[PDB]
Design a protein around this nucleic acid. Structure first.
Lengths: 169, 126, 137, 48, 72
RNA sequence: UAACUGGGGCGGUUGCCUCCUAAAGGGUAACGGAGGCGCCCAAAGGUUCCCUCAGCCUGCAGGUGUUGAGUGUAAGUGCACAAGGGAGCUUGACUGUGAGACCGACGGGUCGAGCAGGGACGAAAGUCGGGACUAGUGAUCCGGCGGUGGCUUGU
RNA sequence: AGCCAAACUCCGAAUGCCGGUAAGUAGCGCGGCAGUGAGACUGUGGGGGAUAAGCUCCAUGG
RNA sequence: UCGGUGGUCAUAGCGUUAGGGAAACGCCCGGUUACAUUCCGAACCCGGAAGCUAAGCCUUUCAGCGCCGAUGGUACUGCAGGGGGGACCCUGUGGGAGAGUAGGACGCCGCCGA
């Protein structure tokens, strides 16, 4: 079963973006490449048990097994030593990416308290988007959403996110 | 040779394979007694030539462009069996018994194993 | 008084003195300059004494550049000590000036005062010096 | 801290090799396999 | 607190170009690979370069790196 | 009841490794100029396979970045083809040898092809006789421990 | 933009060293017997010393 | 006229400008099994051929950054002499850089396959 957003993209989004930006070749048209969700429990340096709960939550929300990252460098101020776990992340691709995107946008995103919209200026200057989440109960600890597109700049990516329905200010 | 650079986004497949190919060619040289047996693995077909790097010339060669393979039944894995057999024949003809196989950068499985086995049963010693 | 705030090796050989200058033979910044004619070591004290001579004479206006820096350490053992038992501690900081090096530079409106100030400096230096004007390349 | 151990298998009962091994790191009696020249085989030589 | 040194090692090239050698002779003693092994030349445990086959010694640049070579 | 020693004493040093002095092979002195060693790792060894860093810019992610990071441990010569980083399997951190060579007055120090046995890794070619290399050590005498069965006073 | 560096080098000679060869005029192996192992000055390249010493310690000639 | 594999290792690179799809290369869409992800068929591995030259790749303009670079001279120097109170300076004969200048250069040379 092709996800709703995957479909909607193939039939309706692709053409209208091509019309809006007047692209000569269809394959140049930007599209979603992957979705990476990050979580950083710096406190894990004090208690390693905290990470276990993190794996449980992340597994639940997205449906893949996180990969736990280990401290790349030892930093004194954070008493950080190289090699100890500090966080978990997941990289979603294909339909699972599309399905997760449907859930967050259509269900969890409005559940932000006092939500007037997510900022449109949070692009990284290459067409990839990022916005952080302050609480986990948003899904039926803070975690970062990173959207990696094929866009070459911000507006092409912003246009694609618009048309996919993200509520930009 | 002296390795190639790294790549970004696209051309990472090409660079990584080429970089991998150099890794394999720092211990596998084309001698006069046992020549090199390069095997390129493209999307369409699979070629394999018997090169003499010490001299620079190529001794034998076979690919999917030959009539024997160009158009026929079977998937790639079984399609490499023809390529393996001919190049073994074209190597036996020009006085070659022992050759040094090299992967070409890609891994040894699937067609590369299949092509090696087809060439190996035809007489050549790996 | 000029001293290097940091130097990699405190104890160094005697900077050799054969040959002409590698470079810095021509006026670069100012309008007038002091060009050496014989090799010598010019200590940080000698440079300071010369600098005061020029600046005091002009008394205002004009700008003086010091193209050489005393960064080579010379050592001296404690007095009345027999030979041996290591090298001495650095005492003097010297700039290895070779023939042809332009040491001091000065720009001033009045030529006569400029030359007078430059001459007063030269008599504080340990080598023969000549006054050079900026060549209009 | 690192004492000299003498390896021995369960058959030849001849002390073949000696080596260093950190006590506190490997308190458990160390073991590996070598070429026993009496046995002429690649047996296992448990640390004495 | 100075006055300490390690006695000399006699490194350096031991067979120069155009010099006929027998298999196994030492060609170069070196630290690290200042010269890489070429055709007919082997590398020892301590970067020593020794001839594998009798011939004349010849230096060159193979694959963008200085190498020693033995020409039968 | 030591020696060296710009008289002797006092102070300091005595062996090994790296750099400079050292004058573009090698070697080269001073109580000349800088430092390290008397270890460590059961993986930080072997093999097969895979990866490229530091730094910078933007909001874990992206762009840039060819060596400026790292290499257990001092410096140097190297290492980006990695010798740096990550996984699978393992014990060659072998037994019997040494064509031929380098360095020492000598004792000695160092590298080493190829072969046999019996193994590891790899499909294979091949690599593996500890560690990227060079310090981490001590001659003989005497004696202890394990093995083997060669021999000593009539048998 | 102009500069400095025994332990800096994008570069880099002259000499010297290793081997081959041509021409021209002592070398090596094996043994018997030694003495020497306190050097001096002068030319050149350096270190210590103070841009000293008929100083001192090295390299290379007389 | 293009694809594969080599040699020299920037006079070849970087950047910039205009293009190409006959076979070929690649993008490319899928995960059924073998195979795999410190998580993800992005990578490896497997099976095809819907669309495409947009990127890679190939061709092409520019000396812009980078790169190469004479001749002449100079420093320096083997040998042999001078001079100076000294630090040091000079010459005859043999050799002769570095920097810089005129310039070069948008690679060149092999083997196969279409």
């Amino acid at each position: 079963t092709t996800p709703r957003l995957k479909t909607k993209y193939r039939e309706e989004i692709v053409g209208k973006l091509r019309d809006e930006f007047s692209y000569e070749n269809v394959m140049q048209v930007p599209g979603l490449v992957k979705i990476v969700v990050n979580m950083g429990v710096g406190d894990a340096a004090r208690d390693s048990k905290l990470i276990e709960g993190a794996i449980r939550d992340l597994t639940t929300i997205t449906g893949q097994k996180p990969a736990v990252t280990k401290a790349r460098k030892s930093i004194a101020q954070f008493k950080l030593r190289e090699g100890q776990p500090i966080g978990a992340h997941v990289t979603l691709r294909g339909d699972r990416m599309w399905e997760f995107l449907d859930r967050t946008l259509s269900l969890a995103l409005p559940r932000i308290r006092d939500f007037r919209g997510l900022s449109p200026k949070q692009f990284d200057g290459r067409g990839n988007y990022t916005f952080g989440l302050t609480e986990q109960v948003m899904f039926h600890r803070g975690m970062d959403i990173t959207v990696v597109t094929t866009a070459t700049n911000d507006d092409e990516g912003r246009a694609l996110l618009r048309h996919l329905g993200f509520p930009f200010k | 040779a002296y390795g190639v650079k790294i790549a970004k986004g696209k051309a990472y497949k090409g660079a990584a394979l080429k970089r991998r190919h150099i890794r394999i060619r720092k211990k596998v040289s084309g001698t006069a007694e046992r020549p090199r047996l390069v095997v390129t693995r493209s999307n369409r077909g699979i070629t394999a030539q018997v090169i003499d790097d010490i001299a620079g010339h190529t001794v034998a060669s076979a690919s999917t462009l030959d009539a024997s393979i160009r158009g026929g039944e079977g998937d790639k894995s079984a399609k490499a069996q023809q390529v393996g057999k001919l190049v073994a024949e074209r190597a036996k003809a020009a006085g070659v018994e022992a050759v040094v196989f090299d992967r070409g950068g890609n891994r040894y499985a699937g067609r590369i194993a299949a092509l090696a086995d087809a060439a190996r049963e035809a007489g050549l010693k790996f | 008084m000029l001293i290097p705030r940091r130097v990699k090796h405190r104890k160094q050989h005697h900077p050799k003195r054969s040959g002409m200058s590698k470079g810095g033979t021509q006026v670069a910044f100012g309008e007038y300059g002091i060009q050496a004619l014989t090799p010598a070591y010019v200590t940080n004290r000698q440079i300071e004494a010369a600098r005061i001579a020029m600046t005091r004479h002009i008394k205002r206006g004009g700008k003086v550049w010091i193209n050489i820096y005393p960064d080579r350490p010379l050592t001296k053992k404690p007095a009345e000590t027999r030979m041996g038992s290591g090298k001495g501690s650095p005492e003097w900081w010297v700039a290895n000036v070779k023939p042809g090096r332009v040491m001091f530079e000065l720009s001033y409106p009045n030529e006569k005062i400029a030359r007078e100030a430059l001459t007063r400096a030269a008599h504080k230096l340990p080598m023969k010096c000549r006054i050079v004007r900026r060549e209009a390349g | 801290v690192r004492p000299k151990i003498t390896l021995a298998c369960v058959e030849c009962k001849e002390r073949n090799y000696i080596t260093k091994k950190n006590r506190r790191n490997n308190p458990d009696r160390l073991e590996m396999k070598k070429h026993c020249p009496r046995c002429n085989a690649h047996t296992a030589h448990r640390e004495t | 607190r100075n006055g300490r040194d390690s006695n000399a090692q006699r490194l350096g090239v031991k067979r120069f170009g155009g010099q006929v050698v027998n298999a196994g002779e030492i060609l170069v003693r070196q630290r690290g690979t200042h010269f890489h092994p070429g055709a007919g030349v082997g590398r020892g445990g301590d970067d020593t370069l020794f001839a594998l086959q009798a011939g004349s010694v010849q230096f060159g640049t193979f694959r963008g790196r200085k190498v020693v070579n033995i020409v039968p």
